[PDB]
Symmetry: C8
Subunit: 144 residues, 8 copies
């Protein structure tokens, strides 16, 4: 029993470092995701001040894709968010980026803004990413 | 008894790390709701400097709906409030938004500001949302 | 005894979360009321730089009611005070607001500033609200 | 005696929770009085850069009473001092205010600054208030 | 023994909140005296950039007395130092002030700066105050 | 048992002080790497606003190498990152630097921007460094 | 041991916040000396951007003595360093000051800058003060 | 055992106060070295934006020695680094300074920038100092 107690004593305090450090990392994670969430306004399935896609009854793309790409670069790298976010969150963002980026590449000599999307697979996939990404960000700080 | 004591010890400290993270999240929640509350001035059932609806004795809408939508976007996404608020609070805000947004869409070539509302269901629903939303925000930080 | 010990331990530490979070909320309450108190200068029964009512021997209203309404909106909503204040404090403020607001609505084409009040019930009620509100704010942070 | 052991412990841990709030309030009190003390320069019985009363050997009043009233309004209401100060401190300040305010009201078409006081009761009462107020402020933060 | 235990516990924890508050006051005292010390440059018995008295072999007064009085008013009242300093420190400062103030009052139509002091009692008393005041300030924060 | 107790106590508390310093260093490490991560945008294998290499289907270099070198100098030395990063992270950065630096040295009288790379070994090595460096930075703060 | 228990416990706790206050004072001492150290650049026995004395093989004085005196006044009095420094540190600084000050007083109608020192006792004493002062400042914060 | 207990208690708590002061000093040391490290860019054996020595295959000196001396003065004295750094770190910096300073003194009427070094002993010694200094700074904060 005495031997077990001593082990608990060292294991318990030791766990003191984990109690103290784990906290510091959590606080950094909380800020990294708090600042990432705003990026989701571009991926919304509701109308907004900006958005990427506009609903009609359709699904026209906007040139706000340029704003999305710039906000994306700042949050993932310049603000350091990429460190505290999971591989799943990064994968979902990367796929979304390629869908909207691809759209702009096809537009080329874009005949004004607001361009109709005829392949609905891209539309449905963007909506699914929004839901999966919103959940992955929301639960990033909800594990305690 | 000794075996149980060890289990209680581990539960007790382990709970220490949870004691320090739950606190950090609470403080973030408190700030997220403190900054959201101001949005409620637009939904008030009393007279105010601005408001959306004006009482007369009929429930005329104001063009302050534009201020509401802009303040809404900033608080939910740019300031990160959407992370720390419940699904019920978001649902209530979304419904309210659609009622006032719809009103503006009907106005189109709006014949000046201050437009009468003839369908009282929208008026009564907006008031009920104000009460439910005010309570949901108020209790967000009142669970300890 | 053993059952009480571990049961006592769960009741105790657990109370550790309440010991901390309760503290964080208290500090927010203290600031919310510290910033609300200044609003009371408008409701004073003594002379001041501004005030609403001026004593003579009377009770003339001033146009400083406009300053009161603007300060009121900022403190209750923009600064988030409304969250940390009781229903009684809000009820007292709301009644006061309606008394002074009503006065201004009656004035309409106001024949200059400083207008006599002939119905003393409003005068006595405003003074009583000042006393009740001053106490309700003062005791908001005095429960420990 | 298990119940007895449980009692004292609950009283103590509960007292630790109360220990964390009493501290927070003390710190607010300390700042509220630190900023109030400067107001006393106007009530001094010694010569100063400004003061209210000037000694000669008679007790002439200065027009610095206007500075006193403005500083008084700011400290009691705008800075929130009125919350953390006792009724005795407020009573003493209020009486002083009325003595100097009354003086200015009598002056009316004031024949320049520096006006002699012929009723020595006001002079002696102002000095006594200075001493009582200086002590009441000084001891506000000296109870531990 | 049992009676002392619980009685001892009430004496102990209770002291805990009081030990905290004592800490908060100490820190305020430390800052109040740190900012007061600079005032002593005017009372030095060595040469300096400014000083009040200049040594020659004499003891000529400078018009820097005006700087002293202004710095004195700011530190004792505007910065709140007067709260955290002892009666002895205030008495010593007050006497010094009256010696230098008196000198200026005698100068009247001052025949330029740098005026000789012929009564050496004032010179020796100012030096003694410097030493007593320097010690009283230095020990203000040295009691633990 | 007694010998282990006091010996255990010396091992324990002693650690306790080490529980704090380890924490302070961790927090510094976390910030040093948070600010280093942004440097990785230059080494990405995806398209970006800037990047070094552009994908086509060939691996053309950009003159953004100048931005990379300047950002590198600031993060490693001026911001002090070099202290809190491992030898492996520094080795990987140094090799990358020499690959891109060498490229620029070969360009000399560079025939405009966007220059093709014909030796694919450099291309594949840069991609491998990106992956190894991204992991080494990511795990720098993940050891608790 | 029972007698020691209660008395020992009171002595122990009592010490508790005295260790706290000791901490607060230490931190103030650390800052006071951190800001004093820079003053030593003037007393160096090596070449520098400024210095007081320049080595040649000599020992010419510079007019940088004026910079020394001004920096000295600011650090000892305006920044409050004089409180947290020992009598030995102050004595060493005072002697140094008088050596360089005396030099300037002898120069009078100074025949340009860079004046040779012919009495080597002053040169050797200044170097010895530098070493003693450097040690006294360095050890001021090294007693734990 | 009883004697060891109370004796052990005096050894223990006592240490406890010191485990807060040791912490405070560590944090100051960490900052002092974090800000010193940047100085090493001048001593690097790799190419850089500035550097002192440039590699060719040689070892030409640059006039950036002036930048080195100015940065050196600021970090050792004005920022207070000299307090928290070891004698070995200071000795290594001093020797380096004299090597580069000497070089500039020999240059005199310097025939433009970029001057070849023909005595390789200075070149090899500067590189060795870089390695020894880099290690001494790096380990300054790595003893826990």
């Amino acid at each position: 029993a005495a031997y077990v107690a001593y082990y608990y004593a060292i294991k318990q305090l030791h766990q003191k470092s984990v109690e103290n450090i784990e906290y510091a990392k959590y606080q950094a994670v909380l800020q990294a995701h708090k600042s990432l969430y705003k990026l989701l306004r571009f991926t919304t399935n509701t109308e907004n001040e900006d958005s990427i896609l506009i609903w009609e009854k359709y699904y026209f793309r906007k040139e706000n894709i340029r704003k999305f790409i710039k906000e994306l670069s700042k949050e993932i790298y310049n603000e350091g968010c990429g460190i505290f976010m999971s591989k799943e969150a990064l994968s979902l963002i990367s796929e979304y980026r390629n869908i909207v980026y691809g759209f702009m590449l096809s537009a080329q000599n874009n005949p004004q803004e607001t361009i109709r999307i005829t392949n609905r697979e891209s539309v449905e996939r963007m909506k699914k990413i929004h839901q999966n990404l919103s959940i992955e960000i929301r639960q990033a700080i909800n594990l305690k």
